Design an enzyme around this catalytic site. Structure first.
Site, short mmCIF file in Angstrom:
data_model
loop_
_atom_site.label_atom_id
_atom_site.label_comp_id
_atom_site.label_asym_id
_atom_site.label_seq_id
_atom_site.Cartn_x
_atom_site.Cartn_y
_atom_site.Cartn_z
N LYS A 186 -19.42 -85.74 -8.20
CA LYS A 186 -18.15 -86.07 -8.95
C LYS A 186 -16.89 -85.52 -8.07
O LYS A 186 -15.68 -86.33 -8.22
CB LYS A 186 -18.35 -85.53 -10.38
CG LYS A 186 -19.00 -86.25 -11.17
CD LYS A 186 -19.05 -87.67 -11.32
CE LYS A 186 -19.91 -88.30 -12.48
NZ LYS A 186 -19.44 -89.69 -12.63
N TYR A 238 -24.71 -82.96 -8.94
CA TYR A 238 -23.93 -83.78 -9.92
C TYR A 238 -22.37 -83.61 -9.54
O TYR A 238 -21.53 -84.41 -9.58
CB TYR A 238 -24.09 -83.62 -11.35
CG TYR A 238 -23.28 -84.46 -12.39
CD1 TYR A 238 -23.68 -85.79 -12.76
CD2 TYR A 238 -22.13 -83.67 -12.87
CE1 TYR A 238 -22.75 -86.26 -13.80
CE2 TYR A 238 -21.38 -84.26 -13.62
CZ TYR A 238 -21.84 -85.66 -14.11
OH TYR A 238 -20.93 -86.38 -15.20
N1 NAD Z 1 -20.52 -87.49 -21.37
C1 NAD Z 1 -19.99 -86.58 -20.58
O1 NAD Z 1 -20.04 -85.56 -20.87
C2 NAD Z 1 -19.19 -86.90 -19.14
C3 NAD Z 1 -18.57 -86.26 -18.85
C4 NAD Z 1 -17.71 -86.57 -17.70
C5 NAD Z 1 -17.93 -87.40 -16.95
N2 NAD Z 1 -19.04 -88.44 -17.27
C6 NAD Z 1 -19.33 -89.54 -16.89
O2 NAD Z 1 -19.15 -90.75 -17.56
C7 NAD Z 1 -19.78 -91.89 -17.14
C8 NAD Z 1 -20.69 -92.50 -18.19
O3 NAD Z 1 -21.53 -92.03 -18.68
P1 NAD Z 1 -22.04 -91.59 -20.31
O4 NAD Z 1 -21.61 -90.21 -20.62
O5 NAD Z 1 -21.24 -92.59 -21.12
O6 NAD Z 1 -23.38 -91.35 -20.10
P2 NAD Z 1 -24.55 -92.48 -20.67
O7 NAD Z 1 -25.86 -92.03 -19.90
O8 NAD Z 1 -24.65 -92.45 -22.22
O9 NAD Z 1 -24.17 -93.90 -20.28
C9 NAD Z 1 -24.09 -93.98 -18.51
C10 NAD Z 1 -24.75 -95.69 -18.66
O10 NAD Z 1 -24.70 -95.82 -17.31
C11 NAD Z 1 -25.90 -96.70 -17.13
N3 NAD Z 1 -26.30 -96.54 -15.80
C12 NAD Z 1 -26.80 -95.40 -14.99
N4 NAD Z 1 -27.14 -95.67 -13.82
C13 NAD Z 1 -27.00 -97.03 -13.46
C14 NAD Z 1 -27.35 -97.70 -12.66
N5 NAD Z 1 -28.03 -97.17 -11.54
N6 NAD Z 1 -27.10 -98.94 -12.60
C15 NAD Z 1 -26.55 -99.42 -13.66
N7 NAD Z 1 -26.33 -98.74 -15.08
C16 NAD Z 1 -26.50 -97.48 -14.87
C17 NAD Z 1 -26.63 -96.23 -18.01
O11 NAD Z 1 -27.91 -96.94 -18.44
C18 NAD Z 1 -25.85 -95.95 -19.25
O12 NAD Z 1 -25.80 -97.09 -20.15
C19 NAD Z 1 -20.69 -91.33 -16.14
O13 NAD Z 1 -20.18 -91.57 -14.68
C20 NAD Z 1 -20.78 -89.82 -16.24
O14 NAD Z 1 -21.18 -88.95 -15.19
C21 NAD Z 1 -19.55 -88.00 -18.65
C1 LIG Z 2 -11.21 -76.13 -19.91
N1 LIG Z 2 -12.46 -76.84 -19.98
N2 LIG Z 2 -13.12 -76.64 -18.83
C2 LIG Z 2 -14.20 -77.28 -19.01
C3 LIG Z 2 -15.40 -77.48 -18.20
C4 LIG Z 2 -16.38 -78.24 -18.41
N3 LIG Z 2 -17.39 -78.73 -17.69
C5 LIG Z 2 -17.95 -77.55 -16.87
C6 LIG Z 2 -19.53 -77.24 -17.02
O1 LIG Z 2 -20.08 -78.55 -16.94
C7 LIG Z 2 -19.51 -79.74 -17.06
C8 LIG Z 2 -20.07 -80.92 -16.94
C9 LIG Z 2 -19.51 -82.27 -17.20
C10 LIG Z 2 -20.28 -83.54 -17.16
O2 LIG Z 2 -19.63 -84.41 -16.34
N4 LIG Z 2 -21.35 -83.75 -17.70
C11 LIG Z 2 -21.89 -82.81 -18.94
C12 LIG Z 2 -23.44 -82.32 -18.48
C13 LIG Z 2 -24.06 -83.85 -18.05
F1 LIG Z 2 -24.49 -84.40 -19.50
F2 LIG Z 2 -25.27 -83.68 -17.60
C14 LIG Z 2 -23.52 -84.72 -17.57
C15 LIG Z 2 -22.07 -85.14 -17.81
C16 LIG Z 2 -18.17 -82.10 -17.68
C17 LIG Z 2 -17.36 -80.96 -17.86
C18 LIG Z 2 -17.97 -79.65 -17.51
C19 LIG Z 2 -16.37 -79.10 -19.77
C20 LIG Z 2 -15.13 -78.83 -20.67
N5 LIG Z 2 -14.19 -78.12 -20.22
C21 LIG Z 2 -12.88 -77.78 -20.83
O3 LIG Z 2 -12.70 -78.36 -22.05
#
Ligand code: NAD
Ligand code: A1CH2
Ligand code: NAD
Ligand code: A1CH2
Lengths: 255, 255
Positions: free
Chosen positions: A154, A150
């Protein structure tokens, strides 16, 4: 800058994507909601149609990692709404077990979707320009011991987006490319860290993430949507890597 | 610390990979040269056999992006030399035209190779530990307008390697994972920036890279190999991102 624009948001059925759809809708965009989960998409479209005119949204089922279907989906969006202004490559998964699929969804599809966005939006093809926003993560900037692939995915988005933004300036495409890098966001994806199916060999160290969730805190999806809107409204932002954390709010990675 | 260790170096037929093989041979390793270029690979091992004893090297033809071949190549190396101590995931291409292949080669194969390396070498699998070094680039740390997907791939390796290093600690695998991020190195890959086949839509902007080459100058492969040896010999280095520049030589990214 958002009113009357046409946005394609991948992953729009729920979570951050849904929040983007709502934020764009509130500001007068039309939105194609693209997601592989038809059932969640149907519910999402149903809820949106209670708040917005039905003509404002379109649901399309697509697995973004199926490039042929992705291309078909862009064709459908532009056939339906007549143009594309805003692309948000938001779909993503956490799957360290089937990690090749994670890379296909989280990175390959972001690149392919980006490239399609440029074909539709570049002035080089008679387009009007536009904006492409790619969803990275803080995991795009720093390591995550319990999800290396992952993390890889990213990171790839950061390097790709920064590079494509520079190339956009060179090509005079009129397209701005930025990426958003959230901390943890309150969405269903957080649940995935509990499942051996999604964590594989890393499942045993899941509580370290659960601790970070609690100690860093979680962000509300609307806040990320705020960041999105900022990117869209500020035409000075190109190659910008936007960080959103609970402590420093909406800011930028400086290089 | 290197003597009698078994090294598997992908992309070993020429360039930096050949330099790694020679550096390792000089320090008493056995080396499996893995490369898809049969002609180059055959001549490399021939050249090596004139300088080192023939039994210290094994050439295996393998497309690393073919996971079945990669897996099989790992099995043949361990069958031939009896164990694995040092994995150098060095193969890479520059190809922004068939950019999906570039990701497969530069990023997918690094991860799959790493995972194979850990399968053999981790203590938790009956291994005796060892080291995995992944070849990133300065393109893993900063943007490259004329090669966004190369950049994405090299960024991916940084995120992956820093993450997997932390996981190796959690898991007490006894394996250290590091990455190297060179500036321009005097190898055949530099020629690819001149070819539309490799540059696709970025071909028209290649002069900017040429300008950076004149600006930064070009490193010799042996210096990169010296970086590899530093990583192998220093057991305190895990998750390190080694940068090698004309200006500063061998140094490390600080986070
Ligand atoms: N939630 C977090 O903590 C977090 C943090 C940083 C980044 N992200 C990123 O934010 C984005 C949105 O994720 P989220 O947190 O809303 O999660 P989520 O799983 O609730 O939503 C993801 C959405 O993308 C869709 N999706 C997944 N794979 C797909 C595919 N192959 N084709 C079409 N649709 C697909 C899912 O069905 C879902 O509706 C992602 O790229 C995730 O990596 C999330
Ligand atoms: C100062 N500070 N530093 C950090 C560092 C953060 N991290 C490091 C650990 O892993 C992460 C994962 C994702 C991530 O995209 N996720 C979460 C796990 C998942 F659901 F499976 C997929 C989507 C985002 C951030 C972090 C988080 C908040 N932070 C903050 O406030
Ligand atoms: N040369 C530079 O300026 C520079 C800078 C930073 C990083 N790098 C990286 O260093 C590594 C070595 O590249 P180089 O500079 O020696 O270039 P090169 O083209 O001379 O050598 C690369 C070698 O990898 C092999 N290879 C490529 N794809 C393969 C595949 N699918 N399966 C098996 N073998 C394959 C090639 O046949 C070749 O022998 C690459 O990862 C490259 O990205 C190079
Ligand atoms: C301080 N400082 N900063 C930099 C930045 C450098 N860059 C940025 C531009 O592109 C690069 C590509 C590669 C790269 O891996 N290549 C070259 C092109 C290729 F043959 F197609 C593939 C392999 C490496 C570095 C850079 C270089 C030296 N630098 C330095 O000394």
């Amino acid at each position: 800058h958002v009113n009357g624009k046409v946005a394609l948001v991948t992953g729009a059925a729920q979570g951050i994507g849904r929040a983007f759809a709502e934020a764009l809708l509130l500001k007068g965009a039309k939105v194609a909601l693209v997601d592989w989960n038809l059932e969640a998409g149907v519910q999402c479209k149903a809820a949106l149609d209670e708040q917005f005119e039905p003509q404002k949204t379109l649901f399309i089922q697509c697995d973004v990692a199926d490039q042929q279907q992705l291309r078909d989906t862009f064709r459908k969006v532009v056939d339906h709404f007549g143009r594309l202004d805003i692309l948000v490559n938001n779909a993503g998964v956490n799957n360290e077990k089937n990690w090749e699929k994670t890379l296909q969804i989280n990175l390959v599809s972001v690149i392919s979707g980006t490239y399609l966005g440029l074909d539709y939006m570049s002035k080089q093809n008679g387009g009007e320009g536009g904006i492409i926003i790619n969803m990275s993560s803080l995991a795009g900037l720093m390591p995550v011991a319990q999800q290396p692939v992952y993390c890889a995915s990213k990171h790839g988005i950061v390097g790709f987006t920064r590079s494509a933004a520079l190339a956009a300036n060179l090509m005079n495409s009129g397209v701005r490319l930025n990426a958003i890098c959230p901390g943890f966001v309150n969405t269903a994806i957080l649940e995935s860290i509990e499942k051996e199916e999604n964590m594989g060999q890393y499942i045993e160290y899941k509580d370290h993430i659960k601790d970070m969730i609690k100690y860093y805190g979680i962000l509300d999806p609307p806040l990320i949507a705020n960041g999105l809107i900022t990117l869209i409204e500020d035409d000075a932002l190109n190659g910008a890597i936007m960080k959103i954390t609970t402590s420093k709010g909406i800011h930028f990675q400086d290089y």
